[PDB]
Design an enzyme around this catalytic site. Structure first.
Site, PDB file in Angstrom:
ATOM      1  N   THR C  44      -5.483  -5.868   6.566  1.00  0.00           N
ATOM      2  CA  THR C  44      -5.921  -7.219   6.260  1.00  0.00           C
ATOM      3  C   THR C  44      -7.029  -7.652   7.211  1.00  0.00           C
ATOM      4  O   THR C  44      -7.905  -8.430   6.816  1.00  0.00           O
ATOM      5  CB  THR C  44      -4.714  -8.175   6.282  1.00  0.00           C
ATOM      6  OG1 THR C  44      -3.623  -7.575   5.552  1.00  0.00           O
ATOM      7  CG2 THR C  44      -5.069  -9.528   5.590  1.00  0.00           C
ATOM      8  N   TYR C 132       4.427   2.252   9.702  1.00  0.00           N
ATOM      9  CA  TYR C 132       3.858   1.548   8.563  1.00  0.00           C
ATOM     10  C   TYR C 132       3.631   2.550   7.437  1.00  0.00           C
ATOM     11  O   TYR C 132       2.729   3.383   7.511  1.00  0.00           O
ATOM     12  CB  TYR C 132       2.591   0.817   8.981  1.00  0.00           C
ATOM     13  CG  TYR C 132       1.804   0.080   7.922  1.00  0.00           C
ATOM     14  CD1 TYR C 132       2.344  -0.236   6.684  1.00  0.00           C
ATOM     15  CD2 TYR C 132       0.510  -0.325   8.194  1.00  0.00           C
ATOM     16  CE1 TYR C 132       1.598  -0.904   5.733  1.00  0.00           C
ATOM     17  CE2 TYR C 132      -0.241  -1.003   7.268  1.00  0.00           C
ATOM     18  CZ  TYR C 132       0.295  -1.289   6.043  1.00  0.00           C
ATOM     19  OH  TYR C 132      -0.499  -1.958   5.150  1.00  0.00           O
ATOM     20  N   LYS C 161       7.247  -1.273   8.739  1.00  0.00           N
ATOM     21  CA  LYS C 161       6.675  -2.045   7.648  1.00  0.00           C
ATOM     22  C   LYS C 161       6.678  -1.129   6.436  1.00  0.00           C
ATOM     23  O   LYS C 161       5.876  -0.198   6.336  1.00  0.00           O
ATOM     24  CB  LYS C 161       5.269  -2.517   7.987  1.00  0.00           C
ATOM     25  CG  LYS C 161       4.632  -3.380   6.908  1.00  0.00           C
ATOM     26  CD  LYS C 161       3.140  -3.565   7.198  1.00  0.00           C
ATOM     27  CE  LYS C 161       2.458  -4.384   6.107  1.00  0.00           C
ATOM     28  NZ  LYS C 161       1.030  -4.664   6.431  1.00  0.00           N
TER      29      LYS C 161
END
Lengths: 300, 300, 300, 300
Positions: C44, C132, C161
């Site tokens: 992001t 992740y 995550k």
């Protein structure tokens, strides 16, 4: 053995019934145009929506119309082993050259289940058998190791309509299987790449519309003219694509109906093309007739 | 009101025929263990290998044994629209609460084809209808907008067994559809996450073996006890996994056969489990019972 | 343990450089709205198009601005194990609370490669580590067994995550790993179903825009209010969907720029939304604000 | 143009440094065995784990060793557009014939993003550019219409290494793009089927081991000898398959190390093969040499 171009014929309908005049003329157009054989009552023939007697009756007319001039491999597969045996037995009684057996769809049997399924059908008949792998419709794949075991134990399993969408699968099959075993393309757009790595023909949808041009593609490659074969492949490729613009057989039957050759009659759940796809197909049909006219020495 | 746990029952066989005595026992075991209804002759009931008359007979026997004590939604779908209509009417004559209609398998209709298929069956019957979306077996998906149009234009389409393997699909359905539309999990392992975003129950395979714990899992969440529901989900999760170790219904029917509740009789193309998978299933079964014994206050 | 809502922040740009004022304002809005921590310079934050020193500076600025009021887990992953070690050590020198390590992208290591990669990074640092998993971007999945082995051997690997798009992965992870290990949603639309089977929070994109409602969603579920949580989920769900209308972070950065909160400056190869998706995002944004106001008692 | 066999070379490492004498040997073996060009520092060369210094130095040494005897197309792509411009410009000063540009990986840009990304790199250099499509590693596909737009607006974009694993994509590319555009197989097992529908060469991994047989495969087809090409294809296909038994370049570098030609120094996150896969590769290696001997007249 089994080589060349085989047409999975539509089932022509008129007023809710089999249109026998339509079938005769379509069969004649195939026989007259260097087609090696016919596959009646498969997917292209809307077998799911035929009654049992219509299924048998379509195979009976095909045999009577063809009168041994070219080969007939009837679609007689089922996801019930008992049913495929009964359908295959009925086709043998009509007098076909062999049967095409799609792998069981929907119930997703294990590979050992597929082994016993196809062995039970093969043992029930003296007919030659073509397996038919199409995971996108069935939800299951016939593994290469399964095909190899099936052929080891079943002498009448002679080939496979390989419609897995994977050219690597063909190389795996040629590595694993004898070579009397016939690998046929099940997807018009992939026939030339399949031939290049050892397939020997096609069970074709496009040959419903263009029998001599599709049939010439395979012959050109098999007699060692790969560049002329590629030329014809490029000419027909946009048609090959748009004949699956929606689920086969809706494009090919719509295309035949735009020609004077059949009624645009489908049985539910198939429905006619959405309007924008109808227009694309119409245009591709026309460019295809133009492009073929300019390369007529390749196929005529 | 469609909510809670519905069991997709096996079809018990003995000596090549429906085992009515076993069927009686299985059904009573469901009714006594807080099951809201029965789905006879779906995938788990080996519908592909039943004869047509067996299909109707299993539905008749379920209704006769059940006597309206719990709900019945009979599997009457087909990949022929005409065949589904006929199956649905036979179920209406038997006297069921509703019908569950799998999407056409194998012939892969367009979305408009699916709309007309399901609309024609709905218009043919007064029964409530649950759609059944399972692309891994069918090769086609019921798009959200298609479900939305079906419900807009067919007042008797009242829910869906969503077995697309996607919890996000549930969020989309609830967004697009009236709150009154009943979304049921079609995958035991996804039931709890489906419930968390608005589904209201399950058409379950695992409830064949563990009806009270599966049924309690759903009730716990619906009564606002998410942590106890999660406790039960996590207790049953390895079993949910191993009931798909090979194609359903082979694990579940093998497990029931090991419990003495039915013959381990499968119709080809289904075949018994690989021996290593049989062992996993056996130990998982016993392990699940051991764990259930420790959390008895949640489901007993 | 790691629980609650962590915001994967955009990297605000102004005139080709880090926008420090925009970063400060965004960070303060997070702290004021019940956010548990910050993940700077992940996907992001457009980590691929930051220089090394921009990467270091964004993490330093975040630490300086936040001044330990909430947690920071810095993105320090790489598909080079050595570069990930170097990035992680730099984050430790800056003084973060932990690091988020994406699995290697593009070079597609084996599971053993993943185990050696993450073990080597874990051994180089005393910081807690969040794995992740995001196969759609990386081309590889961190297998459950690999996660389990990594935790057995590296006590500072404390959670994951999970952005594999599969709720079933969460059930497998909870089966395999201790309770102290924290599974976080990496996909806002799946946070609620992830929670129902054992996740304990989210690394969120939507919280950039709506920190209090997104964080309230997680708190509602964790305190045993599943139906208020579901209500908030359904209120936010169309926003969750449209924040992925094209690849994150283009929609979320486009949304924040529409609110005047950052410049719509994206670094190539990222490009602005196609106009129809911009309009959809704009209309979804407006609808979400009003709908959130109508359920303000759930999150304020 | 760009036609024939180009070898994506490993990066030989020794003791954490470039093994320059091994590089010389590998390059001379290519030049001596009818290879048309070299692709230094792509995926096969472990570009993700090379420092920037090593990336540039490997291209310089390749250029210095080759001395314009055959072509060099350096891998200079990045998922940062700015970084790709910088790597591409260092290759231009070294003096290569072109560059190979993988699509951005991991950040999954939109098609419009791909358009600006590749256009920006093309505008920055006068060098010829080959696009490189490999969605399985990048998470994004270069759409056919995007390739068509890029070539319309960038005269130095002259072909593509197509590694999308789809032969149909080649036919679509030929339909949409000028014949001067060079489509190269990016997958050894698909080279022959790619050629049959209009590809004109290969960026090969297997030519690291068998440069003359692999390059003979292409030449035989290109000079109109399809059946000899097929023979060579089936001789090599199991090697082609097993060179991807785990992620390239672990198999090819393992094979080269077993032949004593380089140290198997892999930089993490790459890890050596699982022992059963090492056994498969070893035997396939021996079998390949044995089979090559019997069709030596095809490639010698």
């Amino acid at each position: 053995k089994i080589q060349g171009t085989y047409t999975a014929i539509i089932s022509p309908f008129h007023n809710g019934q089999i249109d026998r005049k339509a079938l005769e003329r379509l069969l004649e157009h195939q026989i007259e145009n260097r087609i090696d054989g016919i596959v009646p009552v498969g997917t292209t023939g809307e077998s799911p929506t035929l009654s049992y007697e219509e299924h048998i009756e379509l195979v009976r007319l095909t045999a009577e119309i063809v009168e041994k001039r070219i080969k007939i491999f009837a679609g007689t597969g089922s996801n019930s082993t008992a049913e495929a045996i009964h359908l295959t037995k009925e086709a043998e009684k009509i007098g076909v050259d062999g049967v095409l057996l799609v792998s069981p769809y929907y119930n997703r049997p294990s590979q050992e289940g597929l082994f016993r399924h196809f062995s039970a059908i093969a043992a029930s008949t003296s007919l030659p058998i073509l397996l038919y792998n199409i995971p996108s419709r069935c939800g299951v794949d016939i593994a290469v190791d399964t095909v190899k075991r099936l052929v080891e134990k079943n002498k009448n399993i002679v080939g496979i309509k390989e419609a897995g969408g994977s050219v690597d699968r063909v190389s795996q099959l040629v590595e694993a299987l004898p070579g009397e075993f016939s690998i046929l393309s099940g997807d018009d757009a992939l026939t030339l790449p399949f031939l290049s790595v050892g397939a020997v023909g096609v069970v074709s949808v496009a040959s419903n519309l263009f029998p001599r041009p599709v049939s010439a593609l395979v012959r050109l490659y098999l007699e060692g003219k790969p560049f002329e074969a590629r030329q014809l492949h490029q000419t027909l490729y946009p048609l090959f694509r748009d004949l699956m613009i929606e689920t086969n057989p809706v494009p090919v039957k719509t295309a035949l109906a735009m020609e004077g050759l059949t009624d645009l009659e489908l049985r539910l759940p198939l429905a006619p093309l959405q309007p924008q796809n109808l227009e694309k197909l119409k245009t591709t049909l026309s460019r295809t007739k133009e492009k073929l006219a300019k390369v007529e020495h390749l196929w005529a």
